[PDB]
Design a protein around this nucleic acid. Structure first.
Ligand SMILES: Nc1ncnc2c1ncn2[C@@H]1O[C@H](COP(=O)(O)O)[C@@H](O)[C@H]1O
Ligand SMILES: NC(=O)CC[C@H](N)C(=O)O
Length: 529
RNA sequence: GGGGUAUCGCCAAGCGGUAAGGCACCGGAUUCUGAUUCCGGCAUUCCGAGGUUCGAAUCCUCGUACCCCAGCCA
Protein backbone atom coordinates (compact mmCIF):
# COMPACT_ATOMS: atom_id res chain seq x y z
CA UNK A 1 0.00 0.00 0.00
CA UNK A 2 0.93 3.65 -0.42
CA UNK A 3 -0.74 7.07 -0.41
CA UNK A 4 -2.02 6.62 -3.95
CA UNK A 5 -3.68 3.26 -3.29
CA UNK A 6 -5.27 4.70 -0.15
CA UNK A 7 -6.83 7.46 -2.27
CA UNK A 8 -7.96 4.88 -4.83
CA UNK A 9 -9.52 2.83 -2.05
CA UNK A 10 -11.42 5.82 -0.69
CA UNK A 11 -12.70 6.62 -4.16
CA UNK A 12 -13.92 3.08 -4.66
CA UNK A 13 -15.43 3.09 -1.20
CA UNK A 14 -17.14 6.46 -1.66
CA UNK A 15 -18.54 5.43 -5.03
CA UNK A 16 -16.70 8.20 -6.91
CA UNK A 17 -15.20 5.42 -9.03
CA UNK A 18 -16.29 1.87 -9.78
CA UNK A 19 -13.24 0.97 -11.81
CA UNK A 20 -9.70 2.27 -11.97
CA UNK A 21 -8.07 3.40 -15.19
CA UNK A 22 -4.41 4.44 -15.05
CA UNK A 23 -1.82 5.18 -17.77
CA UNK A 24 1.88 5.29 -18.58
CA UNK A 25 2.47 8.34 -20.89
CA UNK A 26 6.17 8.74 -21.62
CA UNK A 27 7.22 11.03 -24.49
CA UNK A 28 9.08 9.08 -27.19
CA UNK A 29 12.30 11.14 -26.96
CA UNK A 30 14.72 8.68 -25.44
CA UNK A 31 14.86 5.21 -23.95
CA UNK A 32 13.12 4.18 -20.74
CA UNK A 33 15.21 4.19 -17.58
CA UNK A 34 14.57 2.52 -14.21
CA UNK A 35 12.71 5.63 -12.96
CA UNK A 36 10.12 4.83 -15.64
CA UNK A 37 10.01 1.24 -14.34
CA UNK A 38 8.80 2.73 -11.04
CA UNK A 39 6.03 4.45 -12.99
CA UNK A 40 5.22 1.31 -15.03
CA UNK A 41 5.00 -0.86 -11.94
CA UNK A 42 2.98 1.80 -10.17
CA UNK A 43 0.43 2.30 -12.97
CA UNK A 44 0.25 -1.18 -14.49
CA UNK A 45 0.36 -2.83 -11.05
CA UNK A 46 -2.50 -0.74 -9.64
CA UNK A 47 -4.58 -1.68 -12.66
CA UNK A 48 -4.08 -5.41 -12.27
CA UNK A 49 -4.52 -5.41 -8.52
CA UNK A 50 -7.72 -3.37 -8.79
CA UNK A 51 -8.91 -5.37 -11.78
CA UNK A 52 -8.80 -2.27 -13.95
CA UNK A 53 -7.11 -0.95 -17.07
CA UNK A 54 -3.85 0.85 -17.85
CA UNK A 55 -2.95 2.39 -21.22
CA UNK A 56 0.46 2.87 -22.82
CA UNK A 57 0.47 6.33 -24.32
CA UNK A 58 3.17 8.14 -26.26
CA UNK A 59 2.93 11.78 -25.23
CA UNK A 60 4.03 12.90 -28.71
CA UNK A 61 3.43 16.65 -28.89
CA UNK A 62 6.97 17.80 -29.70
CA UNK A 63 7.96 16.35 -33.12
CA UNK A 64 11.48 17.83 -33.13
CA UNK A 65 12.43 15.79 -30.07
CA UNK A 66 10.84 12.43 -30.92
CA UNK A 67 11.75 9.45 -33.04
CA UNK A 68 10.07 6.20 -34.05
CA UNK A 69 13.01 4.24 -32.61
CA UNK A 70 11.91 5.38 -29.22
CA UNK A 71 8.27 4.41 -29.47
CA UNK A 72 9.43 0.96 -30.56
CA UNK A 73 11.89 0.69 -27.64
CA UNK A 74 9.36 1.86 -25.09
CA UNK A 75 6.78 -0.72 -26.16
CA UNK A 76 9.57 -3.28 -26.01
CA UNK A 77 10.70 -2.46 -22.44
CA UNK A 78 7.14 -2.25 -21.11
CA UNK A 79 6.47 -5.70 -22.52
CA UNK A 80 9.79 -7.07 -21.23
CA UNK A 81 9.00 -5.87 -17.71
CA UNK A 82 5.91 -8.06 -17.88
CA UNK A 83 3.01 -5.70 -18.30
CA UNK A 84 0.13 -5.42 -20.76
CA UNK A 85 -1.58 -2.19 -21.70
CA UNK A 86 -5.30 -1.61 -22.29
CA UNK A 87 -6.25 -1.92 -25.92
CA UNK A 88 -4.10 -0.37 -28.59
CA UNK A 89 -1.09 1.74 -27.88
CA UNK A 90 -2.35 5.32 -27.72
CA UNK A 91 -0.62 8.50 -28.84
CA UNK A 92 -1.33 12.13 -27.93
CA UNK A 93 -1.26 12.60 -31.70
CA UNK A 94 -4.39 10.47 -32.00
CA UNK A 95 -6.17 13.46 -30.48
CA UNK A 96 -4.69 16.22 -32.65
CA UNK A 97 -8.08 16.92 -34.26
CA UNK A 98 -9.90 16.86 -30.92
CA UNK A 99 -7.33 19.14 -29.34
CA UNK A 100 -7.65 21.62 -32.23
CA UNK A 101 -11.42 21.48 -31.75
CA UNK A 102 -11.08 22.14 -28.03
CA UNK A 103 -8.71 25.08 -28.61
CA UNK A 104 -11.43 26.51 -30.87
CA UNK A 105 -13.90 26.09 -28.01
CA UNK A 106 -11.65 28.06 -25.65
CA UNK A 107 -11.32 30.77 -28.32
CA UNK A 108 -15.08 30.94 -28.88
CA UNK A 109 -15.45 31.18 -25.13
CA UNK A 110 -12.93 34.07 -25.07
CA UNK A 111 -10.52 31.97 -22.96
CA UNK A 112 -7.77 31.69 -25.60
CA UNK A 113 -6.27 34.15 -28.08
CA UNK A 114 -3.52 34.38 -30.70
CA UNK A 115 -0.52 36.24 -29.32
CA UNK A 116 2.16 37.82 -31.53
CA UNK A 117 4.75 38.60 -28.84
CA UNK A 118 8.10 37.09 -29.94
CA UNK A 119 9.42 34.12 -27.97
CA UNK A 120 11.66 36.62 -26.22
CA UNK A 121 8.78 39.01 -25.49
CA UNK A 122 6.65 36.29 -23.90
CA UNK A 123 9.29 35.63 -21.27
CA UNK A 124 9.71 39.40 -20.69
CA UNK A 125 5.96 39.87 -20.17
CA UNK A 126 5.70 36.71 -18.07
CA UNK A 127 6.94 38.25 -14.81
CA UNK A 128 9.31 36.69 -12.26
CA UNK A 129 8.95 34.31 -9.33
CA UNK A 130 8.14 37.42 -7.29
CA UNK A 131 6.81 40.04 -9.75
CA UNK A 132 3.47 39.54 -11.55
CA UNK A 133 3.43 39.21 -15.32
CA UNK A 134 1.62 41.68 -17.58
CA UNK A 135 -0.96 41.44 -20.33
CA UNK A 136 0.03 41.10 -24.00
CA UNK A 137 -1.20 43.95 -26.19
CA UNK A 138 -2.91 41.30 -28.36
CA UNK A 139 -4.74 39.75 -25.39
CA UNK A 140 -8.09 41.35 -26.18
CA UNK A 141 -8.61 40.55 -29.84
CA UNK A 142 -12.12 39.45 -30.73
CA UNK A 143 -13.21 35.80 -30.96
CA UNK A 144 -13.53 36.44 -34.68
CA UNK A 145 -9.92 37.61 -34.97
CA UNK A 146 -8.49 34.80 -32.83
CA UNK A 147 -10.41 32.26 -34.87
CA UNK A 148 -9.01 33.75 -38.09
CA UNK A 149 -5.50 34.08 -36.66
CA UNK A 150 -5.45 30.54 -35.27
CA UNK A 151 -6.60 29.25 -38.68
CA UNK A 152 -3.81 31.26 -40.30
CA UNK A 153 -1.34 29.64 -37.85
CA UNK A 154 -2.80 26.19 -38.58
CA UNK A 155 -2.62 26.79 -42.33
CA UNK A 156 1.15 27.46 -42.21
CA UNK A 157 0.58 31.18 -42.65
CA UNK A 158 2.94 32.26 -39.86
CA UNK A 159 6.71 31.77 -39.55
CA UNK A 160 7.79 29.81 -36.50
CA UNK A 161 7.66 31.81 -33.30
CA UNK A 162 5.73 34.52 -35.14
CA UNK A 163 2.52 33.72 -33.25
CA UNK A 164 1.08 31.17 -30.82
CA UNK A 165 -2.25 30.43 -29.16
CA UNK A 166 -2.24 31.30 -25.50
CA UNK A 167 -4.83 30.67 -22.82
CA UNK A 168 -6.36 33.78 -21.24
CA UNK A 169 -6.02 33.15 -17.50
CA UNK A 170 -4.26 35.40 -14.97
CA UNK A 171 -0.98 37.13 -15.81
CA UNK A 172 -0.53 37.94 -12.09
CA UNK A 173 -1.13 34.44 -10.79
CA UNK A 174 1.44 33.23 -8.26
CA UNK A 175 1.19 30.07 -10.34
CA UNK A 176 3.53 30.88 -13.20
CA UNK A 177 1.93 28.06 -15.19
CA UNK A 178 -1.34 29.99 -15.07
CA UNK A 179 0.13 33.13 -16.60
CA UNK A 180 -1.53 32.71 -20.02
CA UNK A 181 -0.02 29.38 -20.87
CA UNK A 182 0.75 28.71 -24.51
CA UNK A 183 -1.62 26.11 -25.95
CA UNK A 184 -0.17 25.91 -29.49
CA UNK A 185 3.11 26.76 -31.23
CA UNK A 186 4.31 26.70 -34.84
CA UNK A 187 6.72 23.99 -35.92
CA UNK A 188 7.20 23.14 -39.56
CA UNK A 189 8.55 19.74 -38.57
CA UNK A 190 7.39 16.34 -39.80
CA UNK A 191 5.82 14.27 -37.03
CA UNK A 192 6.65 10.53 -36.69
CA UNK A 193 2.94 9.66 -36.68
CA UNK A 194 1.16 12.49 -38.44
CA UNK A 195 3.86 13.25 -41.00
CA UNK A 196 3.43 16.75 -42.35
CA UNK A 197 -0.31 17.10 -41.70
CA UNK A 198 0.23 19.68 -38.94
CA UNK A 199 2.47 22.71 -38.64
CA UNK A 200 1.01 23.58 -35.23
CA UNK A 201 1.41 21.37 -32.18
CA UNK A 202 -0.23 21.44 -28.74
CA UNK A 203 1.73 21.99 -25.57
CA UNK A 204 2.01 19.38 -22.85
CA UNK A 205 -0.36 21.09 -20.39
CA UNK A 206 -3.20 21.40 -22.86
CA UNK A 207 -2.73 17.90 -24.31
CA UNK A 208 -2.32 15.76 -21.26
CA UNK A 209 -5.48 16.49 -19.30
CA UNK A 210 -7.56 16.14 -22.46
CA UNK A 211 -5.84 12.87 -23.52
CA UNK A 212 -6.48 11.65 -20.00
CA UNK A 213 -10.18 12.57 -20.11
CA UNK A 214 -10.78 11.15 -23.61
CA UNK A 215 -9.22 7.83 -22.55
CA UNK A 216 -11.30 7.76 -19.38
CA UNK A 217 -8.40 7.84 -16.93
CA UNK A 218 -9.57 7.85 -13.27
CA UNK A 219 -6.21 8.53 -11.54
CA UNK A 220 -3.48 10.31 -13.46
CA UNK A 221 -0.19 9.37 -11.70
CA UNK A 222 2.87 11.53 -12.31
CA UNK A 223 5.93 12.81 -10.51
CA UNK A 224 6.33 15.79 -8.17
CA UNK A 225 7.31 18.40 -10.78
CA UNK A 226 3.84 18.56 -12.29
CA UNK A 227 2.22 19.59 -9.01
CA UNK A 228 2.05 23.20 -10.12
CA UNK A 229 0.79 21.97 -13.52
CA UNK A 230 -2.20 20.27 -11.88
CA UNK A 231 -3.78 23.76 -11.75
CA UNK A 232 -3.65 24.09 -15.54
CA UNK A 233 -4.67 20.45 -15.90
CA UNK A 234 -7.86 21.30 -14.01
CA UNK A 235 -8.36 24.73 -15.62
CA UNK A 236 -8.34 23.27 -19.14
CA UNK A 237 -10.78 20.50 -18.26
CA UNK A 238 -12.97 22.83 -16.21
CA UNK A 239 -13.25 25.09 -19.24
CA UNK A 240 -14.12 22.78 -22.14
CA UNK A 241 -17.05 20.49 -22.87
CA UNK A 242 -15.72 17.11 -21.74
CA UNK A 243 -17.73 14.60 -19.62
CA UNK A 244 -15.05 13.41 -17.20
CA UNK A 245 -12.31 14.95 -15.09
CA UNK A 246 -9.39 12.67 -14.10
CA UNK A 247 -7.48 13.55 -10.94
CA UNK A 248 -3.72 13.92 -10.88
CA UNK A 249 -1.72 12.63 -7.91
CA UNK A 250 2.06 13.12 -7.76
CA UNK A 251 4.75 10.83 -6.26
CA UNK A 252 8.50 11.45 -6.02
CA UNK A 253 10.78 10.33 -8.83
CA UNK A 254 13.55 7.78 -8.45
CA UNK A 255 17.15 8.87 -8.01
CA UNK A 256 19.78 6.20 -8.08
CA UNK A 257 23.16 6.71 -6.46
CA UNK A 258 26.16 6.88 -8.83
CA UNK A 259 24.09 7.53 -11.94
CA UNK A 260 21.78 9.98 -13.74
CA UNK A 261 18.10 9.27 -14.22
CA UNK A 262 16.85 11.66 -16.87
CA UNK A 263 16.61 11.09 -20.62
CA UNK A 264 18.43 14.37 -21.29
CA UNK A 265 21.62 13.32 -19.49
CA UNK A 266 21.43 9.72 -20.73
CA UNK A 267 21.04 11.07 -24.25
CA UNK A 268 24.21 13.13 -23.80
CA UNK A 269 26.17 9.98 -22.88
CA UNK A 270 24.86 8.15 -25.95
CA UNK A 271 25.32 11.20 -28.22
CA UNK A 272 28.81 11.94 -26.98
CA UNK A 273 29.71 8.26 -27.34
CA UNK A 274 30.84 7.76 -23.76
CA UNK A 275 28.74 4.56 -23.61
CA UNK A 276 27.94 2.17 -26.52
CA UNK A 277 24.32 3.30 -26.78
CA UNK A 278 21.14 3.58 -24.68
CA UNK A 279 21.39 -0.14 -23.92
CA UNK A 280 25.01 -0.13 -22.71
CA UNK A 281 25.18 -2.46 -19.65
CA UNK A 282 26.44 0.42 -17.47
CA UNK A 283 23.36 2.48 -18.36
CA UNK A 284 20.35 2.59 -15.98
CA UNK A 285 18.04 2.19 -18.95
CA UNK A 286 15.69 -0.78 -18.92
CA UNK A 287 17.38 -2.01 -22.10
CA UNK A 288 20.80 -1.56 -20.51
CA UNK A 289 19.80 -3.25 -17.26
CA UNK A 290 18.35 -6.08 -19.38
CA UNK A 291 21.59 -6.30 -21.41
CA UNK A 292 23.56 -6.22 -18.16
CA UNK A 293 21.77 -9.39 -17.10
CA UNK A 294 19.05 -7.94 -14.84
CA UNK A 295 15.76 -9.81 -14.68
CA UNK A 296 12.43 -7.98 -15.16
CA UNK A 297 11.39 -9.55 -11.87
CA UNK A 298 14.35 -8.13 -9.92
CA UNK A 299 13.44 -4.70 -11.25
CA UNK A 300 9.80 -5.32 -10.32
CA UNK A 301 10.99 -6.23 -6.83
CA UNK A 302 13.20 -3.15 -6.60
CA UNK A 303 10.22 -0.93 -7.43
CA UNK A 304 8.14 -2.82 -4.86
CA UNK A 305 10.92 -2.35 -2.25
CA UNK A 306 11.58 1.36 -2.80
CA UNK A 307 7.96 2.37 -2.34
CA UNK A 308 5.99 5.31 -3.72
CA UNK A 309 5.94 8.47 -1.60
CA UNK A 310 6.26 12.27 -1.99
CA UNK A 311 9.70 12.33 -0.42
CA UNK A 312 12.64 13.21 -2.62
CA UNK A 313 14.96 10.22 -2.25
CA UNK A 314 18.13 8.68 -3.58
CA UNK A 315 18.31 4.92 -3.44
CA UNK A 316 21.65 3.20 -2.81
CA UNK A 317 23.14 0.76 -5.37
CA UNK A 318 23.15 -1.94 -2.65
CA UNK A 319 19.32 -1.97 -2.83
CA UNK A 320 19.19 -2.75 -6.57
CA UNK A 321 22.07 -5.21 -6.25
CA UNK A 322 20.30 -6.89 -3.38
CA UNK A 323 17.29 -7.46 -5.64
CA UNK A 324 19.21 -9.01 -8.54
CA UNK A 325 21.37 -11.03 -6.14
CA UNK A 326 18.31 -12.44 -4.44
CA UNK A 327 16.91 -13.58 -7.80
CA UNK A 328 20.08 -15.02 -9.34
CA UNK A 329 21.12 -16.59 -6.04
CA UNK A 330 17.99 -18.70 -6.17
CA UNK A 331 17.84 -19.37 -9.88
CA UNK A 332 21.20 -19.00 -11.59
CA UNK A 333 22.90 -22.32 -12.38
CA UNK A 334 26.53 -22.33 -11.21
CA UNK A 335 29.51 -22.57 -13.56
CA UNK A 336 33.30 -22.27 -13.60
CA UNK A 337 35.20 -19.35 -15.18
CA UNK A 338 38.58 -17.80 -14.47
CA UNK A 339 38.75 -14.07 -15.09
CA UNK A 340 42.48 -13.68 -14.38
CA UNK A 341 44.30 -16.88 -15.15
CA UNK A 342 47.65 -18.46 -14.39
CA UNK A 343 48.55 -22.03 -15.39
CA UNK A 344 48.89 -24.58 -12.65
CA UNK A 345 50.40 -27.96 -13.61
CA UNK A 346 49.76 -31.01 -11.47
CA UNK A 347 52.95 -32.96 -12.23
CA UNK A 348 51.46 -35.60 -9.96
CA UNK A 349 48.59 -36.12 -12.46
CA UNK A 350 48.78 -38.95 -14.96
CA UNK A 351 46.54 -39.13 -18.02
CA UNK A 352 44.87 -37.06 -20.72
CA UNK A 353 42.27 -35.83 -18.27
CA UNK A 354 39.11 -37.11 -16.62
CA UNK A 355 35.55 -36.06 -15.88
CA UNK A 356 34.34 -34.86 -12.46
CA UNK A 357 30.70 -34.32 -11.47
CA UNK A 358 29.51 -30.78 -10.65
CA UNK A 359 26.16 -29.59 -9.17
CA UNK A 360 24.26 -27.01 -11.22
CA UNK A 361 23.26 -25.36 -7.95
CA UNK A 362 25.16 -26.31 -4.76
CA UNK A 363 21.95 -25.86 -2.74
CA UNK A 364 19.28 -27.10 -5.19
CA UNK A 365 19.82 -30.75 -6.30
CA UNK A 366 16.62 -30.59 -8.35
CA UNK A 367 18.46 -28.35 -10.79
CA UNK A 368 20.69 -31.35 -11.48
CA UNK A 369 24.43 -31.73 -12.07
CA UNK A 370 26.89 -31.93 -14.96
CA UNK A 371 30.13 -33.64 -15.99
CA UNK A 372 33.11 -31.30 -16.08
CA UNK A 373 36.59 -32.23 -17.41
CA UNK A 374 39.50 -32.37 -14.96
CA UNK A 375 43.22 -32.67 -15.78
CA UNK A 376 46.81 -31.88 -14.73
CA UNK A 377 47.04 -28.57 -16.60
CA UNK A 378 44.21 -26.40 -15.33
CA UNK A 379 43.71 -22.63 -14.98
CA UNK A 380 43.25 -20.91 -11.64
CA UNK A 381 42.76 -17.28 -10.74
CA UNK A 382 46.00 -15.43 -10.00
CA UNK A 383 44.53 -14.04 -6.78
CA UNK A 384 43.95 -17.56 -5.51
CA UNK A 385 47.64 -18.33 -5.05
CA UNK A 386 49.87 -16.50 -2.59
CA UNK A 387 53.48 -17.64 -2.11
CA UNK A 388 53.08 -16.12 1.37
CA UNK A 389 50.35 -14.08 3.13
CA UNK A 390 48.48 -14.14 6.45
CA UNK A 391 46.66 -16.97 8.17
CA UNK A 392 43.29 -15.50 7.20
CA UNK A 393 44.11 -16.13 3.54
CA UNK A 394 42.24 -19.35 2.83
CA UNK A 395 43.54 -19.92 -0.70
CA UNK A 396 46.63 -21.58 -2.28
CA UNK A 397 49.98 -20.89 -0.60
CA UNK A 398 53.49 -22.09 -1.63
CA UNK A 399 53.53 -25.03 0.78
CA UNK A 400 49.85 -25.40 1.56
CA UNK A 401 46.94 -27.36 0.10
CA UNK A 402 43.54 -26.22 -1.23
CA UNK A 403 40.42 -28.03 -2.35
CA UNK A 404 39.92 -27.60 -6.09
CA UNK A 405 36.23 -26.85 -6.56
CA UNK A 406 34.35 -30.18 -6.82
CA UNK A 407 37.64 -31.93 -7.57
CA UNK A 408 40.76 -32.94 -5.62
CA UNK A 409 42.93 -31.30 -2.95
CA UNK A 410 46.23 -30.02 -4.36
CA UNK A 411 49.51 -28.72 -2.90
CA UNK A 412 51.63 -25.93 -4.37
CA UNK A 413 55.33 -26.73 -4.18
CA UNK A 414 57.24 -24.95 -6.90
CA UNK A 415 56.27 -21.74 -8.62
CA UNK A 416 57.97 -20.33 -11.73
CA UNK A 417 58.21 -16.68 -12.73
CA UNK A 418 59.30 -14.73 -15.82
CA UNK A 419 61.44 -11.68 -16.68
CA UNK A 420 59.45 -9.12 -14.65
CA UNK A 421 59.29 -11.70 -11.88
CA UNK A 422 55.62 -12.34 -12.69
CA UNK A 423 54.65 -15.98 -12.18
CA UNK A 424 53.98 -18.00 -15.33
CA UNK A 425 53.10 -21.41 -13.90
CA UNK A 426 52.49 -23.08 -10.54
CA UNK A 427 53.56 -26.68 -9.99
CA UNK A 428 51.48 -28.77 -7.61
CA UNK A 429 50.73 -32.36 -6.70
CA UNK A 430 47.20 -33.69 -6.31
CA UNK A 431 45.94 -36.25 -3.81
CA UNK A 432 44.83 -39.18 -6.00
CA UNK A 433 41.67 -39.41 -3.93
CA UNK A 434 40.52 -36.30 -2.15
CA UNK A 435 36.88 -35.76 -3.04
CA UNK A 436 39.89 -23.11 1.52
CA UNK A 437 38.23 -23.87 -1.82
CA UNK A 438 39.03 -22.31 -5.21
CA UNK A 439 37.49 -22.54 -8.69
CA UNK A 440 39.50 -23.68 -11.71
CA UNK A 441 39.31 -24.49 -15.43
CA UNK A 442 41.15 -27.34 -17.27
CA UNK A 443 43.29 -25.60 -19.87
CA UNK A 444 42.74 -28.44 -22.38
CA UNK A 445 38.97 -28.25 -22.45
CA UNK A 446 38.80 -24.55 -21.59
CA UNK A 447 36.68 -22.21 -23.68
CA UNK A 448 38.32 -18.85 -24.30
CA UNK A 449 35.92 -16.16 -23.10
CA UNK A 450 35.99 -12.36 -23.00
CA UNK A 451 34.78 -11.13 -19.63
CA UNK A 452 33.38 -7.65 -19.04
CA UNK A 453 33.57 -6.42 -15.47
CA UNK A 454 31.15 -3.56 -15.09
CA UNK A 455 31.19 -0.98 -12.34
CA UNK A 456 29.49 2.29 -11.42
CA UNK A 457 29.29 4.70 -14.32
CA UNK A 458 30.19 7.75 -12.24
CA UNK A 459 32.83 8.42 -9.60
CA UNK A 460 30.41 10.35 -7.42
CA UNK A 461 27.10 9.42 -5.63
CA UNK A 462 25.23 12.30 -7.27
CA UNK A 463 26.78 12.97 -10.71
CA UNK A 464 23.69 14.84 -11.91
CA UNK A 465 24.44 17.61 -9.41
CA UNK A 466 27.88 18.15 -10.93
CA UNK A 467 28.54 21.11 -13.22
CA UNK A 468 29.85 18.77 -15.90
CA UNK A 469 28.54 15.30 -15.02
CA UNK A 470 30.72 13.84 -17.81
CA UNK A 471 34.06 14.85 -16.33
CA UNK A 472 33.11 12.75 -13.32
CA UNK A 473 32.64 9.49 -15.25
CA UNK A 474 34.36 6.40 -13.89
CA UNK A 475 37.19 5.32 -16.25
CA UNK A 476 36.89 1.81 -14.85
CA UNK A 477 33.15 1.53 -15.32
CA UNK A 478 34.06 -1.16 -17.84
CA UNK A 479 37.24 -3.21 -17.55
CA UNK A 480 37.57 -6.02 -20.08
CA UNK A 481 39.31 -9.32 -19.30
CA UNK A 482 40.21 -12.49 -21.20
CA UNK A 483 39.68 -15.60 -19.14
CA UNK A 484 38.64 -19.23 -19.46
CA UNK A 485 35.32 -20.90 -18.79
CA UNK A 486 34.33 -24.54 -18.56
CA UNK A 487 33.39 -25.89 -22.04
CA UNK A 488 29.81 -26.14 -20.68
CA UNK A 489 29.21 -22.45 -21.38
CA UNK A 490 29.70 -23.28 -25.07
CA UNK A 491 25.89 -23.28 -25.26
CA UNK A 492 25.11 -20.27 -23.06
CA UNK A 493 21.96 -18.38 -24.13
CA UNK A 494 22.15 -14.61 -24.66
CA UNK A 495 20.67 -12.74 -21.73
CA UNK A 496 20.52 -15.76 -19.41
CA UNK A 497 22.84 -15.58 -16.40
CA UNK A 498 24.84 -18.12 -14.40
CA UNK A 499 26.76 -17.70 -11.19
CA UNK A 500 30.42 -17.96 -11.98
CA UNK A 501 31.36 -19.56 -8.69
CA UNK A 502 33.27 -17.33 -6.30
CA UNK A 503 33.02 -14.42 -8.76
CA UNK A 504 29.49 -13.22 -9.45
CA UNK A 505 26.57 -13.53 -11.84
CA UNK A 506 27.41 -13.33 -15.53
CA UNK A 507 25.38 -13.32 -18.74
CA UNK A 508 26.20 -13.62 -22.46
CA UNK A 509 25.50 -11.41 -25.54
CA UNK A 510 26.64 -7.89 -24.79
CA UNK A 511 25.82 -7.43 -28.53
CA UNK A 512 29.34 -8.88 -28.98
CA UNK A 513 29.51 -12.63 -28.32
CA UNK A 514 30.31 -14.64 -31.44
CA UNK A 515 30.65 -18.40 -31.85
CA UNK A 516 34.44 -18.02 -31.73
CA UNK A 517 34.72 -15.38 -29.02
CA UNK A 518 31.98 -15.36 -26.35
CA UNK A 519 31.51 -12.17 -24.35
CA UNK A 520 30.31 -12.49 -20.76
CA UNK A 521 28.87 -9.52 -18.85
CA UNK A 522 29.19 -9.47 -15.07
CA UNK A 523 25.74 -8.49 -13.86
CA UNK A 524 26.78 -8.14 -10.25
CA UNK A 525 29.53 -9.60 -8.08
CA UNK A 526 28.89 -11.84 -5.08
CA UNK A 527 28.76 -10.37 -1.58
CA UNK A 528 32.40 -10.01 -0.56
CA UNK A 529 33.09 -9.22 3.09
C1' G B 1 5.98 35.05 -4.50
C1' G B 2 3.68 29.94 -5.22
C1' G B 3 3.78 24.79 -4.88
C1' G B 4 5.78 20.58 -1.93
C1' U B 5 8.59 17.44 1.75
C1' A B 6 10.87 16.87 6.49
C1' U B 7 10.59 9.37 11.13
C1' C B 8 17.20 4.87 12.07
C1' G B 9 23.37 5.51 7.12
C1' C B 10 19.61 4.77 2.54
C1' C B 11 14.49 3.56 1.47
C1' A B 12 9.86 3.27 4.33
C1' A B 13 5.11 2.07 7.93
C1' G B 14 2.68 4.96 11.45
C1' C B 15 -3.83 9.14 10.38
C1' G B 16 -3.91 10.32 19.71
C1' G B 17 -2.57 5.72 22.58
C1' U B 18 2.55 5.54 24.05
C1' A B 19 8.31 4.25 17.17
C1' A B 20 6.57 -2.15 11.31
C1' G B 21 9.51 -3.62 7.55
C1' G B 22 13.65 -3.73 3.77
C1' C B 23 18.54 -2.40 2.41
C1' A B 24 23.20 -1.57 4.99
C1' C B 25 25.74 -2.54 9.32
C1' C B 26 27.92 -5.79 14.02
C1' G B 27 28.14 -10.69 16.36
C1' G B 28 27.58 -16.09 16.31
C1' A B 29 26.24 -21.03 13.55
C1' U B 30 26.54 -23.80 9.73
C1' U B 31 28.83 -24.35 4.36
C1' C B 32 33.50 -27.89 -1.19
C1' U B 33 31.31 -21.19 -3.37
C1' G B 34 35.38 -16.28 2.43
C1' A B 35 28.33 -17.18 -1.32
C1' U B 36 23.92 -18.83 0.36
C1' U B 37 21.19 -20.12 4.92
C1' C B 38 20.80 -19.34 9.98
C1' C B 39 20.02 -17.12 14.36
C1' G B 40 20.96 -12.53 17.61
C1' G B 41 21.89 -6.92 17.61
C1' C B 42 21.00 -2.05 15.62
C1' A B 43 15.68 4.89 16.66
C1' U B 44 13.27 5.71 25.25
C1' U B 45 12.79 8.51 19.52
C1' C B 46 10.38 10.86 14.92
C1' C B 47 13.93 18.90 11.80
C1' G B 48 13.31 22.46 16.01
C1' A B 49 11.18 25.40 19.90
C1' G B 50 6.59 26.15 22.49
C1' G B 51 1.46 24.68 22.98
C1' U B 52 -3.36 21.09 23.70
C1' U B 53 -4.13 16.35 25.67
C1' C B 54 -4.06 11.41 30.91
C1' G B 55 -1.13 10.66 27.06
C1' A B 56 1.10 12.97 20.19
C1' A B 57 5.44 11.09 15.20
C1' U B 58 0.48 11.62 14.95
C1' C B 59 -3.56 18.34 16.63
C1' C B 60 -2.10 23.99 16.78
C1' U B 61 2.09 27.79 16.73
C1' C B 62 6.29 30.04 15.57
C1' G B 63 10.72 28.80 13.10
C1' U B 64 14.75 25.77 10.16
C1' A B 65 16.26 22.87 6.05
C1' C B 66 15.75 20.82 1.18
C1' C B 67 13.11 20.08 -3.58
C1' C B 68 10.10 22.21 -7.86
C1' C B 69 8.22 26.61 -10.99
C1' A B 70 9.90 32.46 -14.87
C1' G B 71 10.66 26.42 -22.52
C1' C B 72 6.59 28.85 -28.15
C1' C B 73 10.23 21.06 -23.60
C1' A B 74 7.79 17.14 -21.25
N1 LIG C 1 12.91 9.47 -12.61
C1 LIG C 1 11.64 9.03 -12.60
N2 LIG C 1 11.20 8.33 -11.53
C2 LIG C 1 9.94 7.86 -11.55
N3 LIG C 1 9.01 7.97 -12.50
C3 LIG C 1 9.48 8.68 -13.54
C4 LIG C 1 10.74 9.24 -13.67
N4 LIG C 1 10.86 9.91 -14.88
C5 LIG C 1 9.70 9.74 -15.45
N5 LIG C 1 8.82 8.98 -14.71
C6 LIG C 1 7.47 8.54 -15.08
O1 LIG C 1 7.51 8.13 -16.43
C7 LIG C 1 6.61 8.94 -17.22
C8 LIG C 1 7.31 9.31 -18.51
O2 LIG C 1 8.51 10.08 -18.24
C9 LIG C 1 6.26 10.14 -16.35
O3 LIG C 1 4.93 10.57 -16.61
C10 LIG C 1 6.37 9.59 -14.93
O4 LIG C 1 5.15 9.02 -14.49
N1 LIG D 1 1.76 13.90 -16.22
C1 LIG D 1 2.65 12.99 -16.58
O1 LIG D 1 2.53 11.79 -16.29
C2 LIG D 1 3.83 13.48 -17.36
C3 LIG D 1 3.89 12.89 -18.71
C4 LIG D 1 5.09 13.35 -19.52
N2 LIG D 1 4.94 12.91 -20.91
C5 LIG D 1 6.39 12.75 -18.94
O2 LIG D 1 6.95 11.87 -19.62
O3 LIG D 1 6.85 13.18 -17.85
Amino acid sequence: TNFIRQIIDEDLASGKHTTVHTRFPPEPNGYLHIGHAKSICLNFGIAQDYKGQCNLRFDDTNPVKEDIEYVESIKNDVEWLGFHWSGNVRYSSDYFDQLHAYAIELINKGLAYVDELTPEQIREYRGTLTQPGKNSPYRDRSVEENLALFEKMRAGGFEEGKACLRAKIDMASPFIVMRDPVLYRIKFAEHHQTGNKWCIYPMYDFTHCISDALEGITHSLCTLEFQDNRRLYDWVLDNITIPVHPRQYEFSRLNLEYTVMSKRKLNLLVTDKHVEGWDDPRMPTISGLRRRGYTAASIREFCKRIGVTKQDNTIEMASLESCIREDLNENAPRAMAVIDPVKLVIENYQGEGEMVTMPNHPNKPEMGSRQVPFSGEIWIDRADFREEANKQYKRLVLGKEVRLRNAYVIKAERVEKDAEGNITTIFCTYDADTLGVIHWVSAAHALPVEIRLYDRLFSVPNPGAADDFLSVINPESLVIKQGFAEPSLKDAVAGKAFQFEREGYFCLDSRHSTAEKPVFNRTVGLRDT
